[PDB]
Amino acid sequence: MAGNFWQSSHYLQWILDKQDLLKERQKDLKFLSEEEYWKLQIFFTNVIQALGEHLKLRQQVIATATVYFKRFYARYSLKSIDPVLMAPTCVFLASKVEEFGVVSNTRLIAAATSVLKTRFSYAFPKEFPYRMNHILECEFYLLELMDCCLIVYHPYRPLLQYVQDMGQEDMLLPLAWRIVNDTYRTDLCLLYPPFMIALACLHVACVVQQKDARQWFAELSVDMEKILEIIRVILKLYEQWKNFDERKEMATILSKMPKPKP
Amino acid sequence: AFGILSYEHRPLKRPRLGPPDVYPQDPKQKEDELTALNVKQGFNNQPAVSGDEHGSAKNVSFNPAKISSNFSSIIAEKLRCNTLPDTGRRKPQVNQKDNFWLVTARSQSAINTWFTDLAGTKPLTQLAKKVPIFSKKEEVFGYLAKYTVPVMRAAWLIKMTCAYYAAISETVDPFMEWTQIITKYLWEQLQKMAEYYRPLPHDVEVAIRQWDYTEKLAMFMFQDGMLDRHEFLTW
Amino acid sequence: YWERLMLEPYGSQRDIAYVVLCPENEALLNGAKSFFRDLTAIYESCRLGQHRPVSRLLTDGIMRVGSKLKLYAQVCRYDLGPYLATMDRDKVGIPTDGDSHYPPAIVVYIIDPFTWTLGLLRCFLEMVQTLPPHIKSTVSVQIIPCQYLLQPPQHLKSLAFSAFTQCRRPLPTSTNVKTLTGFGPGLAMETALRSPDRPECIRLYAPPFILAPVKQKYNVLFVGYCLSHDQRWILASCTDLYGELLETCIINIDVPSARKFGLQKLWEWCLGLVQMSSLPWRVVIGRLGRIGHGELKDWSCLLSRRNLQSLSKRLKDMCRMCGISAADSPSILSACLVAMEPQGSFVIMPDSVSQLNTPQDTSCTHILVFPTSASVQPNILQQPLALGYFVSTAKAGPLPDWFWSACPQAQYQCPLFLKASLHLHVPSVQSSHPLDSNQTSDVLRFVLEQYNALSWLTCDPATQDRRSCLPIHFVVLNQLYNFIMNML
Amino acid sequence: QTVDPQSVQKWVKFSSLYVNLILSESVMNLFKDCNFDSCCICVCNMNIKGADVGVYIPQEAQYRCTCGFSAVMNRKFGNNSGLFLEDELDIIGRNTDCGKEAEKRFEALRALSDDLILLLQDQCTNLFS
Amino acid sequence: MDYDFKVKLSSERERVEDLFEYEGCKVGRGTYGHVYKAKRKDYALKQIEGTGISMSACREIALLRELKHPNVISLQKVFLSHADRKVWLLFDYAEHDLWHIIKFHRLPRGMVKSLLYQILDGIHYLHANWVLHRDLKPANILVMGEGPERGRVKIADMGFARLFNSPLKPLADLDPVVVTFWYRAPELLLGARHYTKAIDIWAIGCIFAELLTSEPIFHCHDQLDRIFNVMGFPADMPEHSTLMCSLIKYMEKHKVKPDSKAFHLLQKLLTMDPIKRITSEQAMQDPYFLEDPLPTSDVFAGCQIPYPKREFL
Amino acid sequence: GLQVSTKQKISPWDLFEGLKPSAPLSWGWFGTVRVDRRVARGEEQQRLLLYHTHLRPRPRAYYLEPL
Ligand SMILES: [Zn+2]
Ligand SMILES: [Zn+2]
Question: Residue type for A38, please?
Answer: W
Closest CA relative to residue B150, chosen from B130, B187, B123, B182? B123
The b/e string for C93-119 (b: 16+ C-beta within 10 A; e otherwise) is eebbebeeeeebbbbbbbbeeeeeeee
Kindly give, in sequence order, each residue whose CB lies less than 8 Å from that of residue E189, ignoring residues fewer than 6 positions away: E223, E224, E227
**Residue type at position E180:** T
Does residue C286 sit in helix, strand or coil?
strand
Q: Backbone phi, then psi, for C9, in 5-degree steps?
A: -85, -175
Q: What residues form DSSP beta bridges with C20?
A: C62, C109
Pairing of strands C233-239, C246-252: antiparallel
Give the helix/strand (H/E) hosting C38: helix C26-45
Interface present between D and C (3 or more CB pairs within 8 Å): yes
Residues E36 and E312: their CA atoms lie apart, in Å, by 9
User: What is the CA(C316)–ligand 1 centre distance, in A?
Assistant: 7
**Cα–Cα distance, C380 to C374 (Å, whole number):** 14
Task: Give the one of C247, C383, C403 whose C-beta lies nearest to D67's C-beta.
Answer: C383
Which of B4, B152, B224 has the most C C-beta neighbours within 10 Å, making it the best mutation to test the interface with C?
B152
Do residue A231 and residue B66 have CB atoms under 8 angstroms apart? Answer: no
In whole angstroms, give the CA distance from residue E141 to residue B29.
Answer: 31
Q: Do chains D and E touch (3 or more CB pairs under 8 A)?
A: no
Residue pair C286/C474 in contact by the 8 Å Cβ criterion: yes
Ligand 1 centroid to residue C206 C-alpha, Å: 24
In chain E, the residue whose alpha carbon lies closest to the alpha carbon of A85 is E1
- Cα atoms in the 13 Å half-sphere on the side-chain side of C317: 6
Residues from chain C that touch A4, judged by Cβ atoms under 8 A, are none
> Is the CB of A26 inside 8 Å of chain F's CB atoms?
no
- CB–CB of E128 and A3 under 8 A? yes
Task: Please state the separation of Cα C54 from the chain's center in Å.
Answer: 28
Cβ pair E113, E295 in contact under 8 A: yes
**CA-based torsion, C452, C458, C461, C465: positive or negative:** negative
Q: Which residues from B are below 8 Å from E when comparing CB atoms?
A: 23, 25, 31-32, 34, 36, 38-43, 45
Cβ(D38)–Cβ(C290) below 8 Å: yes
E249's CB contacts (< 8 A; 6+ apart) are none
Quote the distance between the C-alpha of residue B117 and its chain's center.
Answer: 15
Which of the 8 DSSP states describes residue D43?
Answer: S
Burial bucket for residue E305 (CB in 10 Å: 0-12, 13-18, 19+)? middle
CA distance C348 to C417: 9
Contacts of A19 in chain F (CB under 8 A): 48, 51
Buried b (16+ CB within 10 A) or exposed e, E52-81: ebeebbbbbbbbbbbbbbbbbbbbebbbbe
Q: Which of B99, B95, B82, B220 is nearest to B150 (CA)?
A: B220
**DSSP β-bridge partners for residue C281:** C219, C332
DSSP string for D56-105:
T----------S---HHHHHHHHHHSS--HHHHHHHH-SSSTTHHHHHHH
The DSSP code for C262 is: H
Distance CA B127, CA B110 (A): 13
Q: How far apart are CA C308 and CA F64, in angstroms?
A: 26
Closest CA to C338 of C379, C388, C378, C303: C388
Q: Which helix (H) or strand (E) holds C237?
A: strand C233-239
CB pairs under 8 A between C and E: 48
Element (H, E) at C156: helix C154-165
Which of C27, C64, C24 minimizes the C-alpha distance to C149? C27
State the amino acid at position F35 in one-letter form.
V
**Contacts with F49 (C-beta within 8 Å, 6 or more apart), sequence order:** C276, C277, C278
Q: At a CB cut-off of 8 Å and minimum separation 6, what does A82 contact?
A: A259, A260, E1
* Residue length of chain B: 235
C-alpha to C-alpha distance for A171 and A168, rounded to whole angstroms? 6
3-state DSSP call for residue C239? strand
Q: Separation of D50 CA from ligand 2 center, angstroms? A: 6
Count the neighbouring beta carbons within 10 Å of the beta carbon of residue E210. Answer: 18
Reduced 3-state DSSP string for chain A: CCCCCCCCHHHHHHCCCHHHHHHHCCCCCCCCCHHHHHHHHHHHHHHHHHHHHHCCCCCHHHHHHHHHHHHHHHCCCCCCCCHHHHHHHHHHHHHHHCCCCCCCHHHHHHHHHHHCCCCCCCCCCCCCCCCHHHHHHHHHHHHHCCCCCCCCCCCHHHHHHHHHHHCCCCCCHHHHHHHHHHHCCCCHHHCCCHHHHHHHHHHHHHHHCCCCCHHHHHHCCCCCHHHHHHHHHHHHHHHHHHCCCHHHHHHHHCCCCCCCCC
Report the SS3 class of residue B111.
helix
Q: CA B226 → CA A223, B214, B220, D110, distances in Å? A: 43, 15, 9, 52
C215 Cβ partners below 8 Å, 6+ apart? none
Q: Note the residue count of chain E.
A: 313
What's the CA gap between C459 and C468, in Å, rounded?
8
- Compute the distance between CA of residue C37 and CA of residue B152 in angstroms, rounded to an integer: 11
Q: Classify residue C437 as exposed, middle or buried by CB count within 10 Å of its CB (0-12, 13-18, 19+).
A: middle
Q: Test F56 with C199 for CB contact under 8 angstroms.
A: yes
Chain F residues in contact with D117 by the CB 8 A cut-off are 64
E4 is catalytic: no
- Over the range E126-153, which residues count as b (16 or more CB within 10 Å of their CB) and which as e? bbbbbbbbbbbbbbbbbbbbeeeebbeb
In B, which residues are within 8 Å of A214 by CB distance?
A: 73-74, 77
Catalytic residue among E4, E42, E84, E135: E135
Task: Provide φ and ψ at C143, rounded to 5°.
Answer: -120, 135
Binding residues of E: 27-35, 46
Q: Which of C435, A98, C125 is nearest to E162 (CA)?
A: A98
CB E22 within 8 A of CB E38: yes
**Does any CB of chain C come closer than 8 Å to the CB of residue E82?**
no
How far away is chain E from the Cα of A237, in angstroms, using its nearest Cα? Answer: 31
* CB environment B171-185: b (16+ within 10 A), e (fewer): eeebbeebbeebbeb
Q: Give the whole-angstrom CA distance, residue C215 versus residue F23.
A: 32
Eight-state DSSP code of residue C257: -
CB within 8 Å of D92: residues ≥ 6 apart = D75, D78, D79, D98, D99, D102
Q: Give the Cα-Cα-Cα angle F36, F37, F43 (nearest 5 degrees).
A: 145
From B74, A162, C7, select the one nearest F34 (Cα to Cα): C7
For F4-48, the three-class secondary structure string (H helix, E strand, C coil) is CCCCCCCCCCCCCCCCCCCCCCCHHHHCCCCCCCCCCHHHHHHHH
- Report d(CA E7, CA A55) in Å as an integer: 36
Distance from Cα C328 to the centre of ligand 1, integer Å: 7
A146 — contact with chain C (CB < 8 Å)? Answer: yes
Cα gap D44→D46, rounded to integer Å: 6
Cβ of residue A145 closer than 8 Å to a chain C Cβ: yes
Around C465, how many Cα atoms within 13 Å sit in the side-chain half-sphere?
Answer: 15
Q: What is the distance between the alpha carbons of residues E241 and F46, in angstroms, rounded to a whole number?
A: 70
Using CA atoms, how far apart are residues C368 and C359, in angstroms rounded to an integer? 20
A167 by Cβ neighbours in 10 Å (0-12 / 13-18 / 19+) ranks as exposed
The dihedral through the CA atoms of C105, C111, C112, C115 has a sign that is positive
Backbone φ and ψ for A76, nearest 5 degrees, come out as -145, 160
Interchain contact A60–E (C-beta under 8 A): yes
Q: Rounded CA gap, D41 and D48, in Å?
A: 5
Distance C379 CA to ligand 2 centre (A): 15
φ, ψ for residue C187, nearest 5 deg: -75, -25
In terms of Cα–Cα distance, which of A218, C270, C122 is closest to B80?
A: A218
A62 contact partners, CB below 8 Å, separation of at least 6: A48, A49, A52, A53, A91, A94, B54
**Residue C273 CB contacts under 8 Å (≥ 6 apart), including other chains:** C221, C238, C245, C247
CB atoms within 10 A of CB E199: 24
DSSP code string of C181-227: SSS-HHHHHHHHHS-TTS-S-------S--PPP-----EEEEEEEEE
Interface test with E, best of C89, C92, C178, C179 (most E CBs within 10 A): C92
Nearest CB neighbour to E196, from listed B34, B40, B42:
B34
Residues in the annotated binding site of E for ATP:
27-35, 46
Give the span between the Cα atoms of A221 and B78, in whole angstroms. Answer: 9
3-state secondary structure at position C233: strand
Does residue B134 contact residue B140 with C-beta atoms inside 8 Å? yes
C147: exposed, middle or buried (Cβ count in 10 Å: 0-12, 13-18, 19+): middle
Q: Provide the 10 A C-beta neighbour count for residue A180.
A: 22
DSSP C74: H
CB atoms within 10 A of CB C14: 20
- Distance from residue C331's CA to the centre of ligand 1 (Å): 10
Q: What angle do CA A106, A109, A114 make, to 5 degrees?
A: 125
Q: How far, in Å, CA of A114 to CA of A67, rounded?
A: 24
Contact (CB, 8 A) for C272 and F58: yes
Q: How far is the CA of C435 from the centre of ligand 2 (A)?
A: 27
Secondary structure letter of residue B46 according to DSSP: -
Contacts of B32 in chain E (CB under 8 A): 196-197
Give the burial string for C369-385 (b: 16+ CB within 10 Å, else e). Answer: beebebeeeeebbbbbb
Q: How far apart are CA B47 and CA B30, in angstroms?
A: 15
Neighbouring C-alpha atoms within 13 Å toward the C-beta of C199:
19
Chain C contact for B43, CB < 8 A? no
Is the alpha carbon torsion for B213, B214, B216, B217 positive or negative? positive
What does the alpha-carbon distance between residue C78 and residue E148 come to, in Å, rounded to a whole number? Answer: 34
Please give the C-alpha separations between residue E91 and each of A99, A143, C184, E97, in angstroms, as whole numbers.
26, 20, 21, 14
Residue B40: enclosing H or E segment and its boundaries? helix B36-41
d(CA E172, CA B43): 10
Query: Which H helix or E strand runs over C112?
Result: strand C105-112
Q: Which helix (H) or strand (E) holds C34?
A: helix C26-45
Task: State the DSSP code for B44.
Answer: -
Report the neighbours of E using a cutoff of 3 or more CB pairs below 8 angstroms.
Answer: A, B, C
3 state SS for chain E: CCHHHHHHHHHHCCCCCCCECCCCCEEEECCCEEEEEECECCEEEEEECCCCCCHHHHHHHHHCCCCCCCCECCEEEEEEECCCCEEEEEEECCCEEHHHHHHHCCCCHHHHHHHHHHHHHHHHHHHHCCEECCCCCHHHEEEECCCCCCEEEEECCCCCCEECCCCCCCCCCCCCCCCCCCCCCHHHHCCCCCCCCCHHHHHHHHHHHHHHHCCCCCCCCCCHHHHHHHHCCCCCCCCCHHHCCHHHHHHHCCCCCCCCHHHHHHHHHCCCCCCCCCCHHHHCCCCCCCCCCCCCCCCCCCCCCCCCCCCCC
